Amino acid sequence: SADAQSFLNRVCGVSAARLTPCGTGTSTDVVYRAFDIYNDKVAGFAKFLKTNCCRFQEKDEDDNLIDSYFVVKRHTFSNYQHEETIYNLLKDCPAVAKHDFFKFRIDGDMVPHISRQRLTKYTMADLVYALRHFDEGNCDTLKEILVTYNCCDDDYFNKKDWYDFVENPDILRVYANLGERVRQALLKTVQFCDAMRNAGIVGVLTLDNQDLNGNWYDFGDFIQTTPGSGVPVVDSYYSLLMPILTLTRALTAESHVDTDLTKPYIKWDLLKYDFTEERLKLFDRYFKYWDQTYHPNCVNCLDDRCILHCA
């Protein structure tokens, strides 16, 4: 009675909101996902069990499910105000998911909810964990991710040794279909860092706060400072994401005329061999807030650790 069919149209926003519950009523949903934790008593990069979330998938004209979810969570009252303030400071960035703060009663009391709109099913941390902890006995997440983004079809896995690199070298072409998604995620990350610096917000960026479309959320561990003096910490993010940048060949679009995958290739003259400025431009475009000096020529390095870092 009410509740489920009233919470549904309260989560339902003002745009189109053709929603369907993910097998729940007014209660939360439990999933098994990967996180990156550091909270003074636990640390690591493992798969924990999420507990406090209600998810509503979205439909469209022909009443078939689509890759869009409304994730609404409940928590205390102080985090409500803190997240609302930070989002109000950060809402104008085009790389931040659209939040919605409301209050709804489950009993005689009224509890607050925070709803995020149009997220994907999996985050970037899920993809990184799936590719860095491969096990052919159970790889359902990787297969689902590959088939939901038109990298292959469901009958591609009926083959045996479909994952091998020596046998079936076509898996490289299959993997190289996520590079554009990764590149757009990198660009949106740079945009988010610029917005955080301009707004005066201090926080650490993790892989599980970004979905596979590039949008950011979860400002629950941030603080506030004077405008223009913000500082993001992006060590673990880039360091963990680095091995995936070459498997998927994310920088293929940089060999075309206007960084567009539909135009012909760039025609360099055969007599050019320096390329010392292009490397700096690429570093400034994709790794702007990585704070450690980068030497395009390793003859200027200070020791072997710097040589490794720049190579």
Place this chain on the structure above:
Amino acid sequence: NNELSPVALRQMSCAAGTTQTACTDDNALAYYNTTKGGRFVLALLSDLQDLKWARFPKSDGTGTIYTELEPPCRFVTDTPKGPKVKYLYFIKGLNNLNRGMVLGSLAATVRLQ
């Protein structure tokens, strides 16, 4: 949960100048950290308005480094005193995580504006 340095740090004391040996007695709330290998300062605060130099004494005394600073930032503080203004500095080359640490601790333990 990825927090920015739960266990905090302790202390702020000593000196500063603008041209090498201009550090006379004490012109800095040189802030934080006594690491496990020795005293290694992180943040510098200045009730003054323009400084490029400082000199923190440590251990041997003979070894006290003439630190190169960086262009400052300014803010006003919500102290019980009332109107109080400093000009913020960090030791040059301080990586992002350390500045985040000191800024978070300063903002979350003591009140500022």
Place this chain on the structure above:
Amino acid sequence: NDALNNIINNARDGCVPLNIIPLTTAAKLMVVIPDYNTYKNTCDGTTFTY
């Protein structure tokens, strides 16, 4: 020593990669063909472009 000199002088300091010297100054070309399908796509006819 005329084509080599012609491409050396175009360099801005006299240095050029070694991999483009045979590509722009050689007089003879040798092609090794595995099968006929590859042959009809590379050197079909009497003159080809490469």
Place this chain on the structure above:
RNA sequence: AUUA
């Protein structure tokens, strides 16, 4: 995350 298992602090909601």
